[PDB]
Amino acid sequence: TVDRINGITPSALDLIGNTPLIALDRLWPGPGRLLAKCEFLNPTASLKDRSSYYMIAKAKESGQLKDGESVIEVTSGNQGGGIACVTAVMGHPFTVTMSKGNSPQRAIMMNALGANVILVDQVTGKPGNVTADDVAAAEETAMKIREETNAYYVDQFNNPTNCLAHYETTGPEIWRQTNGRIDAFLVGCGTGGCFVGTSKFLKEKNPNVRCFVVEPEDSISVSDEEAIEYRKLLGQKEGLFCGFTTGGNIAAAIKLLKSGQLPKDAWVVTILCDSGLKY
Amino acid sequence: SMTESTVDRINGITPSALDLIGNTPLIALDRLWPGPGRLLAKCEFLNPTASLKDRSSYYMIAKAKESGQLKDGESVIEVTSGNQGGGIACVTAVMGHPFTVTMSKGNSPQRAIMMNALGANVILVDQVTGKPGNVTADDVAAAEETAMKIREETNAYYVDQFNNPTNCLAHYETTGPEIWRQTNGRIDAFLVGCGTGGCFVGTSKFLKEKNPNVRCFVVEPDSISVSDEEAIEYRKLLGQKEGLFCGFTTGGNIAAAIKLLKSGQLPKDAWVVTILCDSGLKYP
Ligand SMILES: *Cc1c(COP(=O)(O)O)cnc(C)c1O
Ligand SMILES: *Cc1c(COP(=O)(O)O)cnc(C)c1O
């Protein structure tokens, strides 16, 4: 019932989701149409605000996370900022572990949103190069803190409410905003929550909607070169500065539009995942 | 436009980044300020370049087009290292105007990243008196001289933000009216810092027409002063209590608004509105 346009937004939680669906009609002038969800307009400037809100809100509803108790996650990425935002508003202490090998830039927003950032010594890597063993040491620090404090472990890769977020919000919004006119959806996979949750909802509304995973070097392959080139083109043609994964989603969507696999007049929807300012 | 729009951002399709400019949320900072009275703030960090400058950027380009000073597909030039250069880059990108920007080599290269990502042609100009980190009056004057030379050859429209009347107009026609609508006419005080002064002058002029009793304050580094330490402290508290990462000028705005609420100068149940000017991500 919140009116963001003509009323008061009660908290940052009300800024999560209901993102614009922008038409990229200058980047792709036809035939057919390319549209993308503006997930860079979430309060921490990534789609992770949706999964962060769900994982914390559902842990609270189930009674697994009690009023004012501590939360822990291992991350260097957008999910840390998202959880920090939601825990800040809801009054949960938040601890985050990440390798000292990450750029200090990766901690700035999480720390500004009240996260207790624990930098964990690299085991095998050097600065700018966080290895599997570096991350395994940050996971081990987080499990030790969790055992010592009874903190709620968010467990982004194994938490089912991650994909529920996109099934209940992202999917329904796209369906509403297109008034059901959508031939294809595509996005890359980290947790896979956005792809799995959105696609499940869209396929329930229209089973003929074609859902594609964008796979970095059913699926569309994209190189770092394509991601970079289309990140730049999105900025030059649409005035939107997004991250590398957004560049790959645009490159993939344009390959799909030219493929002739869809009708000539196809409407294709993807995701603008985050702000280019997060890099 | 921003004022004649039938675009439904929530339940329909947003035609372009231009339609993302303005109509920003007015957020209640009820955890940072639990009462009595209320602190609210415009989320200008949710503009497409993550600053309030998208509003003045759109007005300056659209009015130059309307007047016939800037013709279809013609070039634009500005001297800037700031949020204004990102805003003008966004608007020129969508509207199909080649955009050139000169700035001193004394600026952090971070200041050019977004402008360049949005297709601005960034020309870096040799410092005349200053050192890296320290851009002087003469360093800036040399950037202006480079831009005037390029403008002589290209006939580019010069934005000239500090002398452009449409700068103020943007806030009189958009920011003020939005705040008045979003509060349903409940506002006892408005405050913001001054750069160009466009936001303060435009917003305050509108609010005073709607409610002559409204008190308008300039935030200075009448008026409310804040130390660097206060701006930093309240930037941190805005993040910790409200989950919003904004720039240093936003910290200054919140410190001033909290000082005003605590002063007892306004009624106990006063509603105070300020501006969350930009994202903390635009800094190091
Ligand atoms: C998380 C993330 C993704 C992938 O989203 P999942 O729902 O985790 O699969 C893509 N791009 C960016 C920038 C992300 O932060
Ligand atoms: C320009 C700017 C201001 C001041 O706004 P004016 O309308 O130019 O006075 C405040 N904060 C930020 C971040 C700005 O970029």
Token pair, residue A94, equals 């938040």
The three-class DSSP label of residue B156 is: coil
Number of neighbours of residue A239 by Cβ within 10 angstroms: 29
Q: What are the CA-CA distances from residue B22 to residues A270, B186, B212 (Å)?
A: 24, 20, 25
- Reported as type and span, the H/E element at residue A177 is helix A171-177
Instruction: Tell me, in angstroms, the distance from the centre of ligand 1 to residue A99's CA.
Output: 20
On whether any CB of chain A is under 8 Å from the CB of B34, the answer is no
Q: Which amino acid is at B205?
A: K
CB contact under 8 A, B31 and A91: yes
Q: Which amino acid is at B96?
A: G
Q: What share of chain A is helix, strand, coil (3-state, %, to 5)?
A: 45, 20, 35
Handedness of CA B75, B76, B77, B82 (dihedral sign): negative
Token pair, residue B15, equals 């035609």
Q: What are the CA-CA distances from residue B261 to residues B25, B42, B67, B217, B264 (Å)?
A: 22, 17, 44, 12, 6
Q: DSSP label at B97?
A: -
Cross-chain CB nearest to B15 (options A23, A179, A278): A23
B76: phi then psi, degrees, rounded to nearest 5 = -130, 140
Across A2-30, b (16+ Cβ under 10 Å) vs e yields: eebeeebbebbbbbbbbbbbbbbbbbbee
Radius of gyration for the alpha carbons in chain B, expressed in angstroms and rounded: 19
| Residue owning tokens 């690299």 | A122
Contact yes or no for A39/A47 (Cβ under 8 A): yes
CA–CA gap between residue A153 and residue A142 (Å, rounded): 8
CA–CA gap between residue A273 and residue A36 (Å, rounded): 9
Number of neighbours of residue B175 by Cβ within 10 angstroms: 27
Residue of chain A minimizing CA distance to B246: A112
Q: Is the minimum distance from the CB of B249 to ligand 2 under 6 angstroms?
A: yes
CA–CA gap between residue B198 and residue B56 (Å, rounded): 8
Contact yes or no for B220/B249 (Cβ under 8 A): no
Measured in angstroms, the CA of A261 and the nearest CA of chain B are apart by 24
In the CATH scheme, what is the code of domain B54-158? 3.40.50.1100
Token pair, residue A67, equals 């009023």
CB contact under 8 A, B9 and A26: no
Which residues, listed in sequence order, are joined to residue A23 by a DSSP beta bridge? A35
Token pair, residue B284, equals 């190091």
Distance of CA A230 to the CA centre of its chain: 19
Q: Which amino acid is at B221?
A: P
Distance of CA B98 to the CA centre of its chain: 22
Length of chain B: 284
Distance of CA A123 to the CA centre of its chain: 28
Q: What are the CA-CA distances from residue B20 to residues A24, A76, B25, B184, B279 (Å)?
A: 13, 29, 12, 22, 16
On whether any CB of chain B is under 8 Å from the CB of A5, the answer is yes
Query: Which segments of chain B does DSSP mark as H helices, in order?
Result: 53-66, 83-95, 110-117, 137-154, 166-170, 176-182, 198-210, 228-242, 248-263
CATH class of the structural domain A48-153: alpha beta
Q: Whose CA is nearest to atom 2 of ligand 2?
A: B195
Peptide bond preceding A31 in cis form (omega within 30 of 0): yes
A83: phi then psi, degrees, rounded to nearest 5 = -65, -35
DSSP string spanning A72-92? Answer: EEE-SSHHHHHHHHHHHHHT-
The three-class DSSP label of residue A184 is: strand
CA–CA gap between residue A240 and residue B117 (Å, rounded): 8
Q: What are the CA-CA distances from residue B273 to residues A3, A186, B117, B130, B210 (Å)?
A: 18, 40, 33, 39, 15
CA–CA gap between residue A28 and residue A39 (Å, rounded): 20
Resolution in A: 2.1
The three-class DSSP label of residue A168 is: helix
The three-class DSSP label of residue A179 is: coil
Measured in angstroms, the CA of B21 and the nearest CA of chain A are apart by 12
Phi-psi region of B161 (alpha: psi -120 to 50; beta: other; left: phi over 0): alpha
Q: Is the minimum distance from the CB of A194 to ligand 1 under 6 angstroms?
A: yes
CA–CA gap between residue A213 and residue A196 (Å, rounded): 10
Closest to A273 measured CA to CA, from A79, A123, A110:
A79
Q: Is the minimum distance from the CB of B111 to ligand 2 under 6 angstroms?
A: no
Which of B 154-213 lie inside 8 A of A, CB atoms? 181-184
CA–CA gap between residue B80 and residue B84 (Å, rounded): 7
Sequence ranges of the binding site of B for pyridoxal 5'-phosphate: 83, 195-197, 199, 249, 277
Q: Which amino acid is at A184?
A: A
Which residues, listed in sequence order, are joined to residue A187 by a DSSP beta bridge? A213
Q: Which residues of A touch B94 (CB under 8 A)?
A: 26, 238-239
Contact yes or no for B81/B107 (Cβ under 8 A): yes
Token pair, residue A173, equals 């919004």
